Design a protein around this ligand. Structure first.
Ligand SMILES: NC(=O)C1=CN([C@@H]2O[C@H](COP(=O)(O)OP(=O)(O)OC[C@H]3O[C@@H](n4cnc5c(N)ncnc54)[C@H](OP(=O)(O)O)[C@@H]3O)[C@@H](O)[C@H]2O)C=CC1
Ligand SMILES: NC(=O)C1=CN([C@@H]2O[C@H](COP(=O)(O)OP(=O)(O)OC[C@H]3O[C@@H](n4cnc5c(N)ncnc54)[C@H](OP(=O)(O)O)[C@@H]3O)[C@@H](O)[C@H]2O)C=CC1
Ligand SMILES: NC(=O)C1=CN([C@@H]2O[C@H](COP(=O)(O)OP(=O)(O)OC[C@H]3O[C@@H](n4cnc5c(N)ncnc54)[C@H](OP(=O)(O)O)[C@@H]3O)[C@@H](O)[C@H]2O)C=CC1
Ligand SMILES: NC(=O)C1=CN([C@@H]2O[C@H](COP(=O)(O)OP(=O)(O)OC[C@H]3O[C@@H](n4cnc5c(N)ncnc54)[C@H](OP(=O)(O)O)[C@@H]3O)[C@@H](O)[C@H]2O)C=CC1
Ligand SMILES: Cc1c(N)cccc1Cn1ccc(OCCc2cccs2)cc1=O
Ligand SMILES: Cc1c(N)cccc1Cn1ccc(OCCc2cccs2)cc1=O
Ligand SMILES: Cc1c(N)cccc1Cn1ccc(OCCc2cccs2)cc1=O
Ligand SMILES: Cc1c(N)cccc1Cn1ccc(OCCc2cccs2)cc1=O
Ligand SMILES: [Cl-]
Lengths: 257, 262, 256, 263
């Protein structure tokens, strides 16, 4: 009951370049006729985002600088999206960070600084984004964050980022419980591994890809467009009965041991 | 871009739907969504006497032809000859929606420790094994791959008051879904479950525990409301189509978030 | 708290010196519990008796129970009650599946095979719990053995995997049912161990080889380690724990 | 024959460090009681200067030949590092650690979870989760033959529980922390596990919103139809800290009357 997203409006957070999971999301939602608003942190992502948008069908470029480490910029940014475009239907959250040092060494060796930075950027950011986005969804809508199986199970070399994704998945459940009575669904997609910018020189990544290929039920890896397709289902009314959920888009790998 | 692109378009696709009893059946919610989305639909039913009502029910869909097959999933021969006949009459298919379970009332009403052997094995057979043999037979009609979806309940994952023998059968079903996904994945067949919140169907009539948990969902669930058959139907169309192309071995909860809280 | 003298336990499913249940018995015997054993078939009893000569039981309490039969499970526990009195718990270490179903494709599983594995490996716990409850009027503890393949699709575990998923739910529903009777019901989820029922799985050494390489503890587990956790779960030490599944698997359950 | 009673758990010759006793109602004092009854040499850590003397009062309730107390605020690397280094010098090698430390700002707990402060979110994560990571790294220096580390969690780390809010996100992080430390430290023969306790009326639970209601719910709905206490957490701790749980690592044992298993 509802196959098109015309008249829908979504914010996409965390496109960095053509290989971003959030750009797969953007491409999909754009082909379904949604208006899209984009948020970036640093500059090279702006001059990039302007270039990538040329591939989309969007009749105007709504681009806002939000570093989610600043409550101010989150609060001001969403307030401004509100003034510029009005109410929205949902947010796609494609944002995380861990220090390379921490991931390279033993988990027991993780710095206090790296642990809290990963938490702040990869989990708390969803909390304050939801709180501010809600102000633009007076009738409800849908919030989707991106996670990885390493938040549910200890995965070799994922280390501090795993604890941050475990924190994130709890965040989704608690937000879902908090925001449900306001008609706002909150859900995660647990993407299988995908070769993005931030996957570059991560140890454990290439071998994890090969392992998926050999052992996952579908015997192949997933891509950004496949995440995008599940994101469209979660952000639309097709999943209207569905909240606090974590959909694995990972070729079945979560289901096997 | 001159046109609205569709998230799901099932024109020229064919799906087998098993387990429609009447208008309030979860599977009829599935049927209404898939029909509206353009699918050709094939229906199966347990007993000869149910055909007439089923066919009369069917007419309010937009199916330019009625495809109805008698299949009691207790009988290997009826499952095998049934899907064989479907193949001969309509061709290859894209998927199967499984909405079939049974547990004895006497077993359900007793204490779980008092469950009868006979009723335990009957619940396993109809509610779980039936997915295995339907998947084997339906695979023959899916030479390029497809999608199979079964219907389960949260009581397969946790002890829910009164759900008793049916909870054990649903746990067996959920694991059936995972092993089938692993077995059939290399053939491009995805196998998934929808864990539906409680819905007022024919089968829910007179089942102890049902109303208690329904009122609990309304009070405590994140959405503070119960789901309907059409919301199961919308999730079924996601799983059964290419919108869910990387997803297999999964159990999507359509239950207002109740699964997520304690 | 620390010694099980003056406790009594029924142990179901010792086959031979390599059975997980014999790990359990050695352990319980060492802690001074009185033990009562069940076995499936009569031609088996004499060689069970010789095995139990290695324990410190003064008296061989041995009862023949094939858990496919209501009547034998009923009369078996009746006899135990009349012969030894009340008990403090049961260790359930029984399972079966036809070997053919485990290394054909899962979608090819036969109906007869599927249900026989459900009957023996899962329903048996329910009826045993029901009859054992009669010997436990101030409460007690029942423990079943499971494997990770009841939680995730483990390659080739197939119909046993579905049976073990059935068993783990059976454990939770029993815990809820019998909790107000002060009876706790829990599972141990053992890592793979080289028992007699493991011979005949093709590639079993390669499976032990994955645990050694990848599990947090980088080693496989043994029958006596299962028994140590069994003693915890069968004693008052775990007095607040019911409906639980403890993995005794060198931490494999926790990694991906 | 056997001429003697085998012992499930004998802790004589074992030494354990216990972090997070505030007072008599602490979950960690219930742990202390059970380890001391079993013969363990215990070493205690505490947060403030001023709480020291009153902790020493508690101790004489125990069979300890001498008071080993070390001031350690887990927010400060130096104090954990120095604290363990000193324990090693004063006492020598150890057999495990029991971690019973958590904090969440009351103001955060009392708002809607969506209103949680950044400062409070990170403070919860630091004390309630990161602290396990650094304790493990330091304790391991005193565990060359290996040993056992246990942390204390709650079901609201696994499911959204009304009013647990930011502490629930912190327990989620802790439960992951536990799995990652299990994987990292397993080759060193160090096991790492959690106990997920049912609600217990401790000093920290006082003033906490949602607590009393859940206590009643447990008595009514849990399989054992009763609440657990601190000594019951202690006995499961003694299992996890000892060789009785050899082979068990990365696990979360629910000591909660079966409530986790129902819906
Ligand atoms: N790649 C994979 O295999 C998997 C990734 N994920 C998750 O998917 C999401 C997207 O990552 P991915 O596409 O891999 O790679 P990208 O590196 O393309 O995207 C990550 C984005 O996070 C942004 N970001 C980082 N810190 C901040 C901050 N302080 N404020 C605002 N934005 C910030 C980056 O912005 P900037 O322009 O500042 O770099 C970038 O746009 C993440 O949550 C990731 O953990 C989940 C499963 C697997
Ligand atoms: N209602 C609810 O609250 C929930 C239901 N579910 C599940 O959804 C599915 C559909 O249930 P629901 O719509 O409630 O009930 P319905 O009674 O509407 O439909 C159940 C169907 O199963 C059929 N069936 C039973 N035994 C057999 C058999 N041997 N061979 C073939 N078909 C058989 C019934 O046939 P007949 O009428 O001929 O006997 C009927 O068509 C079931 O798996 C159920 O467990 C899951 C979660 C919650
Ligand atoms: N070995 C392993 O790797 C693992 C085993 N498990 C589980 O541990 C338990 C013990 O297995 P294990 O020790 O390996 O193997 P064993 O073969 O030693 O023991 C299994 C026992 O079950 C008995 N049994 C089978 N059918 C019946 C029946 N109808 N009535 C009564 N008893 C019956 C067998 O009887 P008989 O002697 O007549 O054959 C045998 O004594 C099982 O539940 C198993 O699935 C769990 C994790 C891994
Ligand atoms: N009570 C319950 O219902 C449940 C509690 N838990 C968990 O059990 C554990 C113990 O809780 P509980 O016994 O209730 O309450 P307590 O209040 O007795 O214990 C909490 C302890 O943590 C110490 N602590 C806090 N911050 C620091 C810090 N910066 N450095 C060092 N120590 C610090 C406190 O010190 P101080 O006195 O200096 O403030 C106090 O001793 C916690 O992890 C809690 O989350 C789990 C499930 C349920
Ligand atoms: C944003 C970011 C940063 N800053 C550092 C490391 C990783 C990531 C994002 N990312 C990237 C890759 C990924 O792959 C999961 C598969 C792996 C397993 C172990 C290590 S990688 C998951 C994932 O979360
Ligand atoms: C087909 C069938 C039969 N023969 C017997 C009982 C139940 C069902 C179908 N059904 C119906 C309702 C349902 O409700 C879930 C909520 C409940 C909780 C406890 C009891 S019912 C789940 C569910 O599976
Ligand atoms: C009693 C029985 C029968 N009749 C048939 C198969 C297996 C068993 C017992 N067993 C034996 C081995 C085992 O190993 C787990 C690891 C495996 C993975 C895939 C196949 S085995 C688990 C396990 O359950
Ligand atoms: C140390 C601390 C601080 N500083 C603040 C809040 C909670 C706690 C410890 N605590 C205390 C009680 C508790 O009870 C679990 C039951 C609950 C459910 C909802 C609210 S309480 C869990 C729990 O973790
Ligand atoms: Cl009939």
């Amino acid at each position: 009951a509802m196959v098109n997203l015309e008249n829908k409006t979504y914010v996409i957070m965390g496109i960095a370049n053509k290989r971003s999971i959030a750009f797969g999301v953007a491409k999909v939602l754009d082909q379904l006729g949604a208006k899209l608003v984009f948020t970036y942190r640093k500059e090279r992502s702006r001059k990039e985002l302007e270039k990538l948008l040329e591939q989309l069908n969007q009749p105007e470029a709504h681009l806002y600088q939000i570093d989610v480490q600043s409550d101010e910029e989150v609060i001001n940014g969403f307030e401004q999206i509100g003034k510029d475009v009005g109410n929205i239907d949902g947010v796609y959250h494609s944002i995380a960070f861990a220090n390379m040092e921490d991931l390279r060494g033993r988990f027991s060796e993780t710095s206090r600084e790296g642990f809290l930075l990963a938490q702040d950027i990869s989990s708390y950011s969803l909390t304050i984004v939801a709180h501010e986005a809600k102000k633009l969804m007076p009738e409800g809508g849908s919030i989707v964050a991106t996670t990885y199986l390493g938040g549910e199970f200890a995965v070799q070399n994922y280390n501090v980022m795993g604890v941050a994704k475990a924190s994130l998945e709890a965040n989704v459940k608690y937000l879902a419980l908090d925001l449900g009575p306001d008609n706002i669904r909150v859900n995660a997609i647990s993407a299988g591994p995908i070769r993005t910018l931030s996957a570059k020189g991560v140890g454990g990544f290439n071998t994890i890809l090969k392992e998926i290929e050999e052992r996952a039920p579908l015997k192949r890896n997933v891509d950004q467009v496949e995440v995008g397709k599940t994101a469209a289902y979660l952000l639309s009314d097709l999943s209207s009965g569905v909240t606090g959920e974590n959909i694995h888009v990972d070729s079945g790998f979560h289901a096997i041991k």
